[PDB]
């Protein structure tokens, strides 16, 4: 997300045994980094390998 020119990230990593779709459970994400960038972001792209 980007709010008031401050881009924020919330990261959570937990192991799960999954096949397709998603598991059923509750999760609370935690801060990762704060990036006072302040640029307009209208779109994004996922980079793969």
């Amino acid at each position: 997300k980007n709010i008031d020119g401050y881009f924020k990230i919330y990261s959570k990593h937990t192991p799960i045994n999954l096949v397709r779709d998603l598991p059923q459970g509750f999760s609370a994400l935690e801060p990762l980094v704060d990036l006072p960038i302040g640029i307009n972001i209208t779109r994004f792209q996922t980079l793969l390998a």
Binding site: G5, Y6, P36, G38
Partner: protein, 49 residues
């Protein structure tokens, strides 16, 4: 004739007068833009009670 090379070299020798002695100048340009502020002065952090 009527054609010259604009760049000229500064004569530098230790025997030159103090007035013409080379001086290294560092010019700091302070500009406040619409972007957020980062660089700030030092801190204090006095004793705790």
């Amino acid at each position: 004739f009527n054609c010259y090379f604009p760049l000229q070299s500064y004569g530098f020798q230790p025997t030159n007068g103090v007035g013409y002695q080379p001086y290294r100048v560092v010019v700091l340009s302070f500009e406040l833009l619409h972007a957020p502020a980062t660089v700030c002065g030092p801190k204090k952090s006095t004793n705790l009670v």
